[PDB]
Amino acid sequence: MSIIGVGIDVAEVERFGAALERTPALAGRLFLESELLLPGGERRGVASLAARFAAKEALAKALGAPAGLLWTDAEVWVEAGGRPRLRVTGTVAARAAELGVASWHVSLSADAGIASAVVIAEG
Amino acid sequence: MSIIGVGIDVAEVERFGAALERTPALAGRLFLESELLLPGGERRGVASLAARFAAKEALAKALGAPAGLLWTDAEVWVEAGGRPRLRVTGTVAARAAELGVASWHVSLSADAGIASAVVIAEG
Amino acid sequence: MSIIGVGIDVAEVERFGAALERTPALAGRLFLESELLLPGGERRGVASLAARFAAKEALAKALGAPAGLLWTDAEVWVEAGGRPRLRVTGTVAARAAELGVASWHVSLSADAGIASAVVIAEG
Numbered sequence: 572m573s574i575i576g577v578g579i580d581v582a583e584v585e586r587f588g589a590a591l592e593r594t595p596a597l598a599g600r601l602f603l604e605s606e607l608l609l610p611g612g613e614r615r616g617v618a619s620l621a622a623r624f625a626a627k628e629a630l631a632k633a634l635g636a637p638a639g640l641l642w643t644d645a646e647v648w649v650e651a652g653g654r655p656r657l658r659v660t661g662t663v664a665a666r667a668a669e670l671g672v673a674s675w676h677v678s679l680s681a682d683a684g685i686a687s688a689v690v691i692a693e694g
Numbered sequence: 695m696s697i698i699g700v701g702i703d704v705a706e707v708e709r710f711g712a713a714l715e716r717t718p719a720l721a722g723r724l725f726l727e728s729e730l731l732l733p734g735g736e737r738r739g740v741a742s743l744a745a746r747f748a749a750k751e752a753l754a755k756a757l758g759a760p761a762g763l764l765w766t767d768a769e770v771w772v773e774a775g776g777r778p779r780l781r782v783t784g785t786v787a788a789r790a791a792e793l794g795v796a797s798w799h800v801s802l803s804a805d806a807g808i809a810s811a812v813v814i815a816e817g
Numbered sequence: 818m819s820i821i822g823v824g825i826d827v828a829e830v831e832r833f834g835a836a837l838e839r840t841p842a843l844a845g846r847l848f849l850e851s852e853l854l855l856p857g858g859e860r861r862g863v864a865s866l867a868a869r870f871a872a873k874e875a876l877a878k879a880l881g882a883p884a885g886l887l888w889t890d891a892e893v894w895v896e897a898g899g900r901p902r903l904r905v906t907g908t909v910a911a912r913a914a915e916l917g918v919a920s921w922h923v924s925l926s927a928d929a930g931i932a933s934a935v936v937i938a939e940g
């Protein structure tokens with residue numbers, strides 16, 4: 572395998588929260604129901620959602636951000652240990668196949684009012 | 695292939711703009727003429743230039759930042775879809791050859807007053 | 818080889834410094850004696866220490882952050898040219914072996930009140 576793409580994204584947390592508040596429908600456009608919940612069932616907070624938004628932007632960048640990708644066709648899920656993972660379906664999986672992507676790597680971080688993500692596509 | 699190096703850089707946009715304003719010659723020292731223009735021919739803005747500066751710093755870091763690298767020997771170019779790409783020549787290409795680098799991967803992001811870049815060298 | 822994990826971390830410098838000041842023992846819990854010194858023997862500054870903290874957090878993330886990792890089992894050392902490098906021992910090396918990690922790549926950056934690091938584990 573080789574690296575197919577890398578993506579990075581930085582998202583200002585306060586601004587992201589404001590966008591979610593302004594348009595009730597936005598959260599459901601960006602996130603699957605599972606992503607909006609913490610492991611124990613409570614509602615995921617704004618900084619953690621901003622990090623997932625950054626991850627999806629970074630994933631899109633790693634794929635060359637073509638038209639027609641759906642936010643809901645990329646899913647951030649969480650291993651028991653807390654580690655974030657990417658699962659791709661539909662439009663995102665189709666684009667990944669065009670480029671020969673077999674494996675996805677992600678990491679997330681938030682501090683100082685920002686959320687960040689890096690994504691590497693490999694295949 | 696294997697990873698040869700990784701680089702990351704974060705640049706404060708306002709400070710970068712101030713540096714460009716202070717010394718008229720600076721932009722031409724850091725950037726090729728093509729980098730200073732948007733696809734349609736207008737002048738590239740300060741945040742986008744800061745992201746390209748970060749990319750060049752990150753590229754230097756991925757190569758172990760030896761003396762003698764020229765800023766103008768690394769070029770950020772743009773695919774039709776908008777995706778940034780690195781082209782290396784001269785001093786930067788020579789150092790890349792010393793290390794066996796065959797392929798370059800870059801991503802850029804700006805928000806919250808900062809521009810950022812990640813670069814991976816592979817070979 | 819393939820990518821085994823990636824980590825990113827962003828650390829607010831001022832807050833990190835405040836934590837070090839609040840608990841005298843903290844620096845020695847996070848850092849080996851060598852990490853606390855500059856090449857010439859003077860004391861390493863807070864932003865540079867924050868970048869090393871971010872590197873260790875990013876390394877932990879690349880390994881899936883299991884319980885039992887010691888901060889002192891990851892060491893940031895510096896090549897003559899200034900390039901940062903990771904050396905792993907003990908608990909961190911043991912976890913790396915569980916995952917098959919052969920090679921480590923790191924880069925550090927600080928600006929705009931933040932320190933950042935990216936780490937890639939390969940094997």
Ligand SMILES: CC(C)(COP(=O)(O)OP(=O)(O)OC[C@H]1O[C@@H](n2cnc3c(N)ncnc32)[C@H](O)[C@@H]1OP(=O)(O)O)[C@@H](O)C(=O)NCCC(=O)NCCS
Pocket residue numbers: 579580581627628630631632633634635636637640641642643644645663741742743745775776777778801802803804805
């Ligand atoms: C292009 C895009 C990915 C980045 O936009 P953004 O997060 O608002 O802005 P950022 O500052 O973080 O990133 C902008 C940088 O992305 C890079 N970029 C632009 N188009 C790109 C593309 N087609 N592929 C990869 N990178 C691209 C550029 O370097 C740009 O900076 P520049 O114009 O100064 O060179 C975004 O506008 C977009 O089209 N998002 C699509 C997301 C998506 O499809 N999601 C559904 C599936 S998860």
Ligand SMILES: CC(C)(COP(=O)(O)OP(=O)(O)OC[C@H]1O[C@@H](n2cnc3c(N)ncnc32)[C@H](O)[C@@H]1OP(=O)(O)O)[C@@H](O)C(=O)NCCC(=O)NCCS
Pocket residue numbers: 702703704750751753754755756757758759760763764765766767768786864865866868898899900901924925926927928
């Ligand atoms: C070393 C350099 C790359 C980073 O400087 P910077 O962007 O101003 O500062 P940042 O905070 O972003 O990065 C500093 C970190 O880079 C790392 N670094 C220093 N020397 C390095 C080197 N030789 N190789 C890789 N990384 C290096 C260090 O970890 C340092 O932090 P630390 O001293 O606390 O450990 C920069 O000073 C430099 O020499 N730039 C050269 C650019 C160049 O050659 N361009 C032309 C070709 S594109």
Ligand SMILES: CC(C)(COP(=O)(O)OP(=O)(O)OC[C@H]1O[C@@H](n2cnc3c(N)ncnc32)[C@H](O)[C@@H]1OP(=O)(O)O)[C@@H](O)C(=O)NCCC(=O)NCCS
Pocket residue numbers: 618619620622652653654655678679680681682825826827873874876877878879880881882883886887888889890891909
């Ligand atoms: C999990 C941890 C790595 C990140 O915490 P942090 O730096 O305070 O917080 P950040 O915002 O930077 O990162 C949090 C993100 O890390 C990710 N994360 C959580 N658990 C993780 C794990 N087991 N593996 C990889 N990533 C993990 C998550 O995506 C989380 O964000 P989310 O909850 O919104 O999804 C940290 O809490 C930790 O346990 N550190 C261990 C360090 C260590 O073991 N050091 C000694 C050896 S060097």
Ligand SMILES: [Mg+2]
Pocket residue numbers: 580581582628803804805
């Ligand atoms: Mg963005």
Ligand SMILES: [Mg+2]
Pocket residue numbers: 703704705751926927928
């Ligand atoms: Mg820098």
Ligand SMILES: [Mg+2]
Pocket residue numbers: 680681682826827828874
């Ligand atoms: Mg952190």
